[PDB]
Amino acid sequence: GPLGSPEFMEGVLYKWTNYLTGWQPRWFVLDNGILSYYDSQDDVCKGSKGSIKMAVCEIKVHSADNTRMELIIPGEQHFYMKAVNAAERQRWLVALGSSKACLTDTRT
Secondary structure, three states: OOOOOOOEEEEEEEEOOOOOOOOEEEEEEEEOOEEEEEOOOOHHHOOOOOEEEOOOOEEEOOOOOOOOOEEEOOOOOOEEEOOOOHHHHHHHHHHHHHHOOOOOOOOO
16 A cells, blocks of 8 residues: 555554653554554554654664564654563564555555
């Protein structure tokens, strides 16, 4: 499609919210590029309403070891998050960058 492969991946992402409070397992799910934030798998319907638009901006992956990922999106670029495991963290990079894979500049 006009963005890449319309992926849809869901599951808890262990996010680093602050130095004090890291490891935070929070429910995350990627829909058509929009990676939204929830506090539970039943919360998926509404959540905090806030969502990451990884399509218009970039899905960041670096940390040169197991588990590496972050999200930079519209208005606010700052999402540091770890995963249940490494291929878990991979999985996201996978879905995200497969769904945004056609956007080299910006989903607009």
